[PDB]
Amino acid sequence: AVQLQASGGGLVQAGDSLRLSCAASGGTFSHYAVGWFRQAPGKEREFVAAISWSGRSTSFANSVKGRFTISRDSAKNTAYLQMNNLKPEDTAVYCCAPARFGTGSAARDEYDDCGQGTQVTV
Amino acid sequence: AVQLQASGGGLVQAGDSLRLSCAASGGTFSHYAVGWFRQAPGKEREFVAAISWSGRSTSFANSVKGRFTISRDSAKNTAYLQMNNLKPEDTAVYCCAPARFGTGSAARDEYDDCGQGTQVTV
Amino acid sequence: AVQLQASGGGLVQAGDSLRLSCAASGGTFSHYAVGWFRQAPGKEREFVAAISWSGRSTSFANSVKGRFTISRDSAKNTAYLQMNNLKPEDTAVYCCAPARFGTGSAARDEYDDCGQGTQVTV
Amino acid sequence: AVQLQASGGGLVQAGDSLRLSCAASGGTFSHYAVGWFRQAPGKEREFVAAISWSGRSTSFANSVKGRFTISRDSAKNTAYLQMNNLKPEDTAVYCCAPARFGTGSAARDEYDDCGQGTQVTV
Amino acid sequence: AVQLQASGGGLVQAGDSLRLSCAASGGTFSHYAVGWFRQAPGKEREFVAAISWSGRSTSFANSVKGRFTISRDSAKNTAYLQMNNLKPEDTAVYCCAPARFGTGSAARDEYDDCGQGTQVTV
Amino acid sequence: EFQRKLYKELVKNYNPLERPVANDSQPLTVYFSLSLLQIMDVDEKNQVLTTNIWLQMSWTDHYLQWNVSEYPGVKTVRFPDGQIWKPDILLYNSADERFDATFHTNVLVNSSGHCQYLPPGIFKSSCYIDVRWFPFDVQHCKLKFGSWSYGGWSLDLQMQEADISGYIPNGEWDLVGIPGKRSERFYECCKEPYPDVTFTVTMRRRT
Amino acid sequence: EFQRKLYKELVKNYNPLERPVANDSQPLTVYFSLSLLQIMDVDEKNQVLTTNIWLQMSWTDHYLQWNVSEYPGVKTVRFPDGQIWKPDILLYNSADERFDATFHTNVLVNSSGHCQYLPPGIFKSSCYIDVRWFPFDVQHCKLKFGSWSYGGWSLDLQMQEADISGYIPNGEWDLVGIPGKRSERFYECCKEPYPDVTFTVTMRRRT
Amino acid sequence: EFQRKLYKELVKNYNPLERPVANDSQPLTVYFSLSLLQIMDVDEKNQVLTTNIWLQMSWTDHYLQWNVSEYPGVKTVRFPDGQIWKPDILLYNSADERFDATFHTNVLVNSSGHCQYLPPGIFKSSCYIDVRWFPFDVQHCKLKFGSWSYGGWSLDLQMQEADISGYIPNGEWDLVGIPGKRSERFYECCKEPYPDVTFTVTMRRRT
Amino acid sequence: EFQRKLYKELVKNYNPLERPVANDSQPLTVYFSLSLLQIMDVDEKNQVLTTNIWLQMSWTDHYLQWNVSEYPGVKTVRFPDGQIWKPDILLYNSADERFDATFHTNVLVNSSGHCQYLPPGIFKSSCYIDVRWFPFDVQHCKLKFGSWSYGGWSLDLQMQEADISGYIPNGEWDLVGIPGKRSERFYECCKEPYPDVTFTVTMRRRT
Amino acid sequence: EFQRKLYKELVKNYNPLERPVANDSQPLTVYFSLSLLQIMDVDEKNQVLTTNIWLQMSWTDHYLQWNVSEYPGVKTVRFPDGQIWKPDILLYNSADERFDATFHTNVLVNSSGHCQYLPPGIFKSSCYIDVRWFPFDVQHCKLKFGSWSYGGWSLDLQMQEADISGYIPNGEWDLVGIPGKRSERFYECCKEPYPDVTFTVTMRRRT
Numbered sequence A, B, C, D, E: 001a002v003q004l005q006a007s008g009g010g011l012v013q014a015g016d017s018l019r020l021s022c023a024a025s026g027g028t029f030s031h032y033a034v035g036w037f038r039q040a041p042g043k044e045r046e047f048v049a050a051i052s053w054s055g056r057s058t059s060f061a062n063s064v065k066g067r068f069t070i071s072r073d074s075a076k077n078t079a080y081l082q083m084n085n086l087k088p089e090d091t092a093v094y095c096c097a098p099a100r101f102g103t104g105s106a107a108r109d110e111y112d113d114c115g116q117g118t119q120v121t122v
Numbered sequence F, G, H, I, J: 001e002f003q004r005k006l007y008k009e010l011v012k013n014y015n016p017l018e019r020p021v022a023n024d025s026q027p028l029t030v031y032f033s034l035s036l037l038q039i040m041d042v043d044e045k046n047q048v049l050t051t052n053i054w055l056q057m058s059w060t061d062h063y064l065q066w067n068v069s070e071y072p073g074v075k076t077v078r079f080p081d082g083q084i085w086k087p088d089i090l091l092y093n094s095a096d097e098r099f100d101a102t103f104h105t106n107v108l109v110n111s112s113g114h115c116q117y118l119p120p121g122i123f124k125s126s127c128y129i130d131v132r133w134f135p136f137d138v139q140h141c142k143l144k145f146g147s148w149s150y151g152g153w154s155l156d157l158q159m160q161e162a163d164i165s166g167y168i169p170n171g172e173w174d175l176v177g178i179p180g181k182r183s184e185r186f187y188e189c190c191k192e193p194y195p196d197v198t199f200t201v202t203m204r205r206r207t
């Protein structure tokens, strides 16, 4: 919803589970798809996971296909990225971006700018 | 107003306050929205705060949501970015950009080119 | 087909052959052209090979013109990049990009975003 | 005029004056505005000064507002950037770019590509 | 002609001459203009020389104006960049790009993608 | 400015080609009605009825919605032709050369996403005028309206009673009334049922 | 050049879809007036009045403003149709097939943002022409103008007296004057009030 | 939403200029048929037949296909004029000033790529009306349709029987049937053969 | 290719909305002239004159200039409507429904920037025809041309004598000459004076 | 797909504004011819000839060429109006209100770059009709075609004999033949000579 902020990042050990939160502010959360992205210290920004505005469509990167899950909750205006056993290359800063009535796809052109992300270190 | 110039930077200690000024030249200041950006030498340019052409709409990045305030003053053709307690993460060069009758949003396509920013160090 | 994932990378010696697999998921594989790209540690992303949606048109970079071959198999929804004698210049991460009914050309605008590639080292 | 070439760069001490020349070739000089840009060893290209095709409009960066002047002379098909007391911050390679009947503004979407600039060091 | 490949690079001493070749494949060579570009180890790609599809128009960068010549030969589907006395600043990787019925200009939007260039060192 | 912000935000990812439903499996309900302003010409020789009509289409977009608190002072927006999805309702029995005789105006959308499209037009429809009872003939002129490319599985066309509160009486013909009926017909082109709304003009020759 | 610079600066962030008000909670005042050049034809059989008319619409954009000292020599700019916001004033009682019979010309804007729009056109409007008094009948022909999609909450339509100095006398019909009045009507389509201005041509058949 | 995803995916790399075949060496088969709704006017003086006709064109794109499981609820899409390839079927013996008298509607495409297109129109075609047997003349009015820029090597125009289920009887003319025939003709413009389908209206004057 | 290079170069930074002067403080001089090919119809009942006319507009752009040595073989370029600035000359006393009855052709520009524009058209202008002297009436038909949105402060409209060499004699009406005059009128719309040129057809009824 | 690849390659750097020559110093040769299908009417009162004609323009682009081995199965391409350069041939003696009465179809280009363009249209042209020998008059109707903005230095217009094989007999008028001639005329507008081709219909009234 216009402004999306990520939270819940921290330092974990390999194989541990981490839940990332994305809170909405500045609009109606149910009108926007939520897309998650990573940026490594020296790498480019990459897609991770997405959920559609209705939650019926989800997309995942292949590395996180079986390990990350995405969920929505309109009551708290929050999108949750659940993370099962994490691995060294999951260490990066995660940003959350809105897509106005998006389809929950990996296409970057349908998303707005990310907020200020949260660092996850494994 | 066409040309916006930032000023008022310097070196401060953590938790201190700092006021940044943006003077207009080359046009009518009341016809332009003012946006603030950080360069963060090792990072990319990021949105900080914005004020609409009428001053009725403001946008803030989440990191500076409760600590930075933005204001306009047409008598001196100036936009003021007031900064409460600062953090080492705020050390960067701040640039000021105009947007013709902008809404005070965080969209980069709405703003003109930034001037030559001023460095603040915390 | 919407989502393309490369696999089969590893470490090889100069002059050795290597086959790279590219699995499709999320759509009809026969409706998409598959384009192969490299990225070296320090370098820009470069075209390598391509195959049209029907397999009747193929494109190759000049360095890999006589050494790399490309093939399709709709039964397993896979695109195979066969590699004859390799050279130290082939050490890079290879990625797959779909192109909806593409002509198997080297034009980047025709292709979708690459997935998460696989590293090969010579 | 289609092709603009900068010249006259060199090494100077702080507080000295320096004149940069920009010769035209490949077209009519009076049909083009002349823009000056600074590259810097590690920074991005930034606008410095501009003069309209008729010489009636000039734009300057705020750092060089009171120190740099710009002038045109159609007899020699040349544009001159005069520089008063220079500062260590004015150490960079300067490029000269044409704008077809440009207004002498700082907008980048109006100029053509620069030539091969000349280095000045203070 | 669709695919252009550079060749003939190597190591030379200052003041020596060098001929670079550009072979065409994948189309009609007479329908395409040929543009030459340098990449350099740490700099951006820069225009060097160009020839029109008919060979009646040529463009050169100022640094190589009086030292580099460009020619076409439709018999061998080749474009030749002759290089008179070479200088250390010419040490770079040269790429060759086609432009469909191009005018032999320096405009980048008119050319296609370069192939894999050849390194010359002075 | 909040109008600028809302106009920028609404068109994000918006595709005018897409039917604006939230499920893609249930039809979009489009309410259709008429406003007869004038019966302009009843051509007995050419068998053509010429009327001045304002069509009324109402639907829900579900993609153009906003919170009035976040956009103060902006309760409605207007979109021109080709910028948002519109129903392709056409006059089946059109005698006009251009077939679609309506004038495209703005679509009015409010914060809940309700789109109101009120096209004015001069419509030429085919009517059989019986001159057998010459002085006292009651004529029934059908105006059949429906979507051309959307069936009842995609566009549920519902009927609302026509408005004659702005009717300017004719000199030669008296308006008995304009009843409407909604039907669903199968055409030889297609296996999809096609709903339509037919309004019967039902005039009487004046003494 | 200053004109080029001004056009580039003015088109920045401008949305033609947005009503150009500084405060979205306030109606935009649009002054509307007429300029009758000649009465082309009075069709007694078809109940249609044909006139040559220049409409006059004036409003304030507040988005197209500049300082003449900052843009020397540039006091006015001209914008074509579809590049800036225009009122959708239409002839309600239009007898024309295209309904909108006006010719779209440039909108003229001066430094303070005042946009003026003077579209010429041959207007065909429905008129009830009585032949009961035949030789010396006075005929009142109504020309009703108003915004189609903007109500009184968004577009406040003010009326100005019709211009007559450019009128050329007709052969068969004598003009006694064209008074105009502004009303605010309610329609069955929405609860939104709609202001309109009506000019009565009020001709007399010449001896 | 799956409609948005499907439209975005379908418009990828799509060129409306390109004939949507999978081989480029075999012709695209386009099935053409007619739907007569009304013989509106038989102008004996001007030798022009005016008819209300819905054309029917069917072909396969092979570029607009999707899996309904991957796009649940989306079984059909609709594309406007100029967004996808359409056959350039024209009425050769057209008496209309605009020549192409058809109204461009949406093209309907289903999951297997079958595009189906029903342009309605009022068609004016040249017809030799012979008044030798004034009350008992049987008149054969030819309606010749074919692609203008595509020959038989590129567009294989197949013929389907015309539809008379929706025909509305005329007042002065009986419809005895509309036989259609497909023939390939050669023109002096090029060596390219051009297929065409001709429907003969074959009316009879009523008593 | 030099013509390709010139077309690429000329449109750089070019704004068709901008009046192509070099100072912005002095008016652009536009030379306007007529070319009467034939008087197609003189309608005494409708008081409308129908003529076939080629307009001639000439001006200087100062933005479309090049060196013929730098572009060998390219002495002229041609620009379609909407790609470069054109004067908005209109027929004030136009009796046509679309008002602007001219056909938009290419604007021809030569190396010094001289743009020349020759739109042909069938012009319908209002004319008062006196039937007093039935076989010996000399009729003065006025054709008034001028810029609609540009006044004398911005567009200085100069007059050139009408071309007659291409005239073909009419059957019923004899042409005695078409003199033109340039005036500068004031309108109630604004304080801006507007120059105009009026050509009087001045026909004579043939025996 | 080879057709898709060919279209993408052909549209590269292409400017429709540019005359497609290889030297810019020699004229582009455009071959023009007629195909008379039928004479719709011969208006003696309005002095207007109404005919159905397919124009035929042939030229060489030199920018749309390809090797059929590199694009197997793709021997021709078709380009719509506004996507490639076309000659601006117009009917000088046009009596139509729109002047250009032709219907814009696709331009057909083959591998060697030969573009061929066959626009159909109903043409209304001014003709002098003599009723002196009322039942035995031979009427010479002139049809003058030429480029409007290209002279002989840029566009060399060559003439080809008109096509009659598709003509259908007229009821009242017999076609004795349509000879064409090519001339080069000078106009007062510029020193540029303008070639034109004129076809004379040369009808005879039937007994």
Ligand SMILES: *[C@@H]1O[C@H](CO)[C@@H](O[C@@H]2O[C@H](CO)[C@@H](O)[C@H](O)[C@H]2NC(C)=O)[C@H](O)[C@H]1NC(C)=O
Residues within 6 Å of the ligand: F110, F111, F112, F113, F114
């Ligand atoms: C937007 O307009 C719609 C329709 O005018 C309003 O919907 C209401 O509820 C039903 C839903 O279709 C309509 O039939 C009613 O006529 C509408 N009004 C009432 C009082 O029920 C909707 O409330 C409007 N939204 C806003 C925010 O004003």
Ligand SMILES: *[C@@H]1O[C@H](CO)[C@@H](O[C@@H]2O[C@H](CO)[C@@H](O)[C@H](O)[C@H]2NC(C)=O)[C@H](O)[C@H]1NC(C)=O
Residues within 6 Å of the ligand: G110, G111, G112, G113, G114
């Ligand atoms: C621009 O033009 C307008 C209207 O011509 C001028 O507006 C003034 O105030 C009202 C409208 O608010 C007009 O009716 C008056 O006629 C104008 N006052 C005058 C002419 O004294 C406005 O001043 C103009 N702005 C300029 C010329 O900068």
Ligand SMILES: *[C@@H]1O[C@H](CO)[C@@H](O[C@@H]2O[C@H](CO)[C@@H](O)[C@H](O)[C@H]2NC(C)=O)[C@H](O)[C@H]1NC(C)=O
Residues within 6 Å of the ligand: H110, H111, H112, H113, H114
């Ligand atoms: C899409 O529509 C086409 C035509 O309506 C279907 O094609 C089938 O095969 C021919 C047409 O080539 C018809 O005679 C059949 O009646 C069509 N239907 C069936 C069931 O065979 C095609 O199957 C449709 N594709 C879908 C619905 O996915």
Ligand SMILES: *[C@@H]1O[C@H](CO)[C@@H](O[C@@H]2O[C@H](CO)[C@@H](O)[C@H](O)[C@H]2NC(C)=O)[C@H](O)[C@H]1NC(C)=O
Residues within 6 Å of the ligand: I110, I111, I112, I113, I114
């Ligand atoms: C371009 O055309 C113009 C007008 O056709 C030429 O202008 C000359 O000066 C006036 C018009 O301002 C005419 O009376 C002259 O006859 C024009 N020609 C000459 C030779 O004086 C202008 O010279 C042309 N520019 C070219 C050909 O480069």
Ligand SMILES: *[C@@H]1O[C@H](CO)[C@@H](O[C@@H]2O[C@H](CO)[C@@H](O)[C@H](O)[C@H]2NC(C)=O)[C@H](O)[C@H]1NC(C)=O
Residues within 6 Å of the ligand: J110, J111, J112, J113, J114
């Ligand atoms: C493309 O078409 C042209 C013309 O149709 C072919 O060139 C010849 O053109 C002349 C006159 O222009 C004709 O009389 C000849 O019949 C044409 N053909 C030959 C073989 O001479 C040209 O060959 C065609 N290119 C192809 C088919 O690749």
Ligand SMILES: *[C@@H]1O[C@H](CO)[C@@H](O)[C@H](O)[C@H]1NC(C)=O
Residues within 6 Å of the ligand: F023, F025, F026
């Ligand atoms: C969509 O409609 C189908 C049937 O029409 C229904 O089964 C499904 O639950 C609907 N989806 C939602 C999200 O309500």
Ligand SMILES: *[C@@H]1O[C@H](CO)[C@@H](O)[C@H](O)[C@H]1NC(C)=O
Residues within 6 Å of the ligand: A028, F067, F068, F069, F070
């Ligand atoms: C609109 O916003 C207000 C405050 O921002 C909030 O209380 C209200 O719930 C919002 N409306 C909806 C429908 O979410």
Ligand SMILES: *[C@@H]1O[C@H](CO)[C@@H](O)[C@H](O)[C@H]1NC(C)=O
Residues within 6 Å of the ligand: G023, G024, G025, G026
């Ligand atoms: C806008 O208008 C509303 C009502 O007209 C008023 O209450 C409000 O104060 C106005 N806002 C401004 C900034 O003038």
Ligand SMILES: *[C@@H]1O[C@H](CO)[C@@H](O)[C@H](O)[C@H]1NC(C)=O
Residues within 6 Å of the ligand: B028, G067, G068, G069, G070
């Ligand atoms: C216009 O500019 C001048 C000087 O640049 C200034 O004095 C004047 O106040 C400006 N006008 C407005 C309305 O700000």
Ligand SMILES: *[C@@H]1O[C@H](CO)[C@@H](O)[C@H](O)[C@H]1NC(C)=O
Residues within 6 Å of the ligand: H023, H025, H026
């Ligand atoms: C295309 O058609 C040609 C002949 O029409 C045939 O030889 C060829 O096999 C076809 N291509 C495919 C892929 O079927």
Ligand SMILES: *[C@@H]1O[C@H](CO)[C@@H](O)[C@H](O)[C@H]1NC(C)=O
Residues within 6 Å of the ligand: C028, H067, H068, H069, H070
């Ligand atoms: C459609 O998808 C389903 C499951 O995703 C698959 O079983 C089926 O084969 C697909 N259809 C086609 C034609 O590939």
Ligand SMILES: *[C@@H]1O[C@H](CO)[C@@H](O)[C@H](O)[C@H]1NC(C)=O
Residues within 6 Å of the ligand: I023, I025, I026
């Ligand atoms: C522009 O015109 C004004 C007055 O018309 C004049 O004072 C000024 O000198 C002109 N500018 C140039 C550059 O000639």
Ligand SMILES: *[C@@H]1O[C@H](CO)[C@@H](O)[C@H](O)[C@H]1NC(C)=O
Residues within 6 Å of the ligand: D028, I067, I068, I069, I070
């Ligand atoms: C055109 O170019 C030639 C040589 O390039 C030069 O001598 C001449 O002065 C130029 N013309 C103008 C008007 O500058």
Ligand SMILES: *[C@@H]1O[C@H](CO)[C@@H](O)[C@H](O)[C@H]1NC(C)=O
Residues within 6 Å of the ligand: J023, J025, J026
């Ligand atoms: C172009 O034409 C001119 C004369 O028309 C001729 O002198 C010149 O050689 C031609 N150029 C080419 C490349 O053939």
Ligand SMILES: *[C@@H]1O[C@H](CO)[C@@H](O)[C@H](O)[C@H]1NC(C)=O
Residues within 6 Å of the ligand: E028, J067, J068, J069, J070
């Ligand atoms: C077309 O291509 C074939 C083989 O690729 C080649 O032999 C032939 O010369 C080419 N045609 C032309 C005109 O270059």
